[PDB]
Amino acid sequence: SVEFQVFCFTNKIRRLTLHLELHKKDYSSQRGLRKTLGKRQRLLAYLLKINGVRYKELISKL
Amino acid sequence: NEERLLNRFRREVMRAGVIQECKRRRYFENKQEEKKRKHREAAK
Amino acid sequence: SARKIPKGVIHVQASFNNTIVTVTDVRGRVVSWASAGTCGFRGTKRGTPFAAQTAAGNAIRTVVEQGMQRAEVMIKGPGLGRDAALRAIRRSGILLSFVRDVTPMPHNGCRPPKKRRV
Amino acid sequence: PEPQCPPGLRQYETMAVLRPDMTEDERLTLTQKYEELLVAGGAMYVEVFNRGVIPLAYSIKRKNKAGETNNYLDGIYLLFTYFTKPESISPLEAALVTDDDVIRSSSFKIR
Amino acid sequence: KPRLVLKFIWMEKNIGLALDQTIPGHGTVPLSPYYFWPRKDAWEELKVLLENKPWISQKQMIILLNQATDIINLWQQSGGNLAS
Amino acid sequence: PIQSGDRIDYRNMSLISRFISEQGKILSRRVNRLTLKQQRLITSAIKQARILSLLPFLNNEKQF
RNA sequence: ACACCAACGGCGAAAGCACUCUGCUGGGCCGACACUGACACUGAGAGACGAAAGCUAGGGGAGCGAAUGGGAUUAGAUACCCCAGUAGUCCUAGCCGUAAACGAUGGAUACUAGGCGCUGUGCGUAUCGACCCGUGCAGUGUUGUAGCUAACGCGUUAAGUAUCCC
Numbered sequence: 214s215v216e217f218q219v220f221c222f223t224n225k226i227r228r229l230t231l232h233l234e235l236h237k238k239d240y241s242s243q244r245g246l247r248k249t250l251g252k253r254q255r256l257l258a259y260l261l262k263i264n265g266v267r268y269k270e271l272i273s274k275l
Numbered sequence: 276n277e278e279r280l281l282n283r284f285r286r287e288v289m290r291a292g293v294i295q296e297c298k299r300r301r302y303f304e305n306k307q308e309e310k311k312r313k314h315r316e317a318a319k
Numbered sequence: 320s321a322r323k324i325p326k327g328v329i330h331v332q333a334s335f336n337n338t339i340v341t342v343t344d345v346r347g348r349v350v351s352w353a354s355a356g357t358c359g360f361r362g363t364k365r366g367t368p369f370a371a372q373t374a375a376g377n378a379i380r381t382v383v384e385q386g387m388q389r390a391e392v393m394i395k396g397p398g399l400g401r402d403a404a405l406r407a408i409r410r411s412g413i414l415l416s417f418v419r420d421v422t423p424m425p426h427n428g429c430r431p432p433k434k435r436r437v
Numbered sequence: 438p439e440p441q442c443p444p445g446l447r448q449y450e451t452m453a454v455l456r457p458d459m460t461e462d463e464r465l466t467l468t469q470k471y472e473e474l475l476v477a478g479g480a481m482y483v484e485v486f487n488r489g490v491i492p493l494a495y496s497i498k499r500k501n502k503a504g505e506t507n508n509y510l511d512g513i514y515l516l517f518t519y520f521t522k523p524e525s526i527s528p529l530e531a532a533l534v535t536d537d538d539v540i541r542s543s544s545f546k547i548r
Numbered sequence: 549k550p551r552l553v554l555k556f557i558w559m560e561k562n563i564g565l566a567l568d569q570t571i572p573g574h575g576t577v578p579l580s581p582y583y584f585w586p587r588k589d590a591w592e593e594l595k596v597l598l599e600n601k602p603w604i605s606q607k608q609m610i611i612l613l614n615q616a617t618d619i620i621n622l623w624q625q626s627g628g629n630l631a632s
Numbered sequence: 633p634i635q636s637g638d639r640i641d642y643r644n645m646s647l648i649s650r651f652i653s654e655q656g657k658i659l660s661r662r663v664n665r666l667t668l669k670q671q672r673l674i675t676s677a678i679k680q681a682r683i684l685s686l687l688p689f690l691n692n693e694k695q696f
Numbered sequence: 697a698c699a700c701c702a703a704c705g706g707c708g709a710a711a712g713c714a715c716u717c718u719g720c721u722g723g724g725c726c727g728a729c730a731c732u733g734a735c736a737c738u739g740a741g742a743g744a745c746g747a748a749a750g751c752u753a754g755g756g757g758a759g760c761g762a763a764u765g766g767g768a769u770u771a772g773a774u775a776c777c778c779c780a781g782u783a784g785u786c787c788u789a790g791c792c793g794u795a796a797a798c799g800a801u802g803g804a805u806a807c808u809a810g811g812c813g814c815u816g817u818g819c820g821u822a823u824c825g826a827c828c829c830g831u832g833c834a835g836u837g838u839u840g841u842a843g844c845u846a847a848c849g850c851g852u853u854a855a856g857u858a859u860c861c862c
Contacts, residue, residue, distance in 0.1 A: 233721085
């Protein structure tokens with residue numbers, strides 16, 4: 214299941230970001246946010262590598 | 276009373292050697308590995 | 320004089336280069352103190368077991384106006400002045416209830432100063 | 438019987454020691470501030486049971502409201518096996534610090 | 549849990565205290581450790597060995613330590629005097 | 633030994649105080665002969681009971 | 697600042713991290729096929745973090761303590777010793793971006809004796825419950841075969857055999 218990985222990582226970045234911006238100095242979870250961004254980004258380049266229209270739907274969903 | 280000394284004998288339970296330890300400076304793992312390597316091997 | 324009660328605590332500040340033999344009552348008003356610097360000789364000689372013996376003897380020889388039976392001793396600190404002091408009090412042989420230590424055992428409070436390098 | 442509700446929120450247990458003097462408004466008023474917790478928490482609040490007063494090791498420093506007087510040797514050992522949301526535990530800490538008959542209140546989280 | 553023997557020896561210069569210890573609920577073999585002629589601590593060495601065991605009950609450790617203490621005590625008095 | 637099934641809490645002052653000395657200080661794993669997990673868990677529990685003044689931080693020295 | 701606990705121990709990518717408790721939150725490990733189906737590795741330039749000392753701004757300042765000052769040793773002593781002692785040490789917000797930042801060992805995968813260990817989980821035995829034995833893995837350590845090495849040594853966590861990338 215791929216779109217649950219992208220969507221799940223998106224909610225991960227939402228909850229972790231609204232953690233981090235009202236907190237502002239945790240330099241440990243910064244790596245977690247950046248590993249999630251990079252991991253999701255290699256997924257988006259993967260599904261963009263496979264398809265057009267379907268990845269256009271992944272952009273249009275979020 | 277007799278001339279027996281159990282305060283020195285009991286004293287080595289928690290030795291006064293934690294006070295000859297604490298006169299000189301707080302120094303890190305080189306002399307804590309020397310003193311605590313010789314001390315981890317003195318009790319074994 | 321004093322309260323005239325023959326029970327009372329004895330504190331022995333055994334330093335690394337000195338000894339102090341003080342004796343006081345239960346509340347803490349000192350009835351006498353005598354150290355190694357008190358009993359005459361002073362310098363590198365003070366703080367040796369002969370100074371502990373002489374300082375303890377000249378300390379508690381002057382409590383004969385009280386004649387304390389029930390003694391209890393509360394020593395403190397490192398040095399070569401402990402065991403000769405306890406042999407001095409047991410030499411006077413008065414009713415030594417219990418000796419004890421009250422030495423400051425820190426829980427990493429302040430930084431102790433530089434190592435000597437001598 | 439306790440694993441019924443912890444779908445949704447958390448579980449704790451607060452240890453709080455008391456004054457040894459009063460016997461009245463001690464089971465009462467501290468259960469009334471437990472009802473203040475009930476306005477806050479509202480979950481399976483059970484087993485708030487009391488432990489007998491015994492001599493502790495060493496305690497000073499009551500800090501009454503402008504008293505700063507009483508040393509102690511004894512204390513009533515309350516412990517609340519309560520159950521709440523993880524939100525609003527710091528106001529339980531302020532409630533169990535500021536009040537007079539509660540000193541030295543350490544909460545915990547049993548698993 | 550078997551039960552226990554300290555063995556002391558007094559010769560004028562030198563104490564030996566020898567702690568023979570015994571089994572808990574777990575099958576174990578102690579020696580008798582003999583603590584030695586130089587001024588190196590006998591009571592601390594013995595008691596610490598017992599505490600390190602936990603295999604020794606408090607009553608057991610204490611009874612042996614009391615006997616050990618008594619001999620070190622007699623030894624100190626004889627050494628300070630000449631008893632022999 | 634002495635695990636006794638129920639977990640070690642500050643409320644269990646039976647197996648706790650078999651682990652401190654009469655001088656009131658925590659004994660190591662090789663003395664108490666437990667696992668690492670038992671040792672750390674009684675360590676945190678003993679220091680909790682140290683906060684509640686159930687246990688002394690220092691016991692006054694005694695003779696005779 | 698946090699004694700005993702402290703362990704040749706646990707965690708972190710490294711630097712680091714230990715009085716306890718709570719909250720938010722990262723990361724790891726293990727199992728079942730529960731799902732997708734190569735989404736993988738490395739990484740120029742780039743970006744982040746980065747002990748200590750240093751600097752800007754404001755607090756705070758017990759101990760320790762460069763500089764400094766006095767005493768001593770000394771031919772001399774700007775130094776070791778001792779007595780005072782300022783910046784600093786701590787915290788807030790930044791800058792600085794260096795260390796023997798060391799495992800003196802970039803990362804990743806596959807394969808190649810063992811012994812003795814520790815930590816985490818999994819299965820079976822044993823009891824029906826804590827043990828306890830073997831093990832399946834992952835990580836950490838110590839001796840060590842083969843092989844490599846100028847030698848010392850390293851040796852399944854290679855400095856072995858190969859492949860890739862800087």
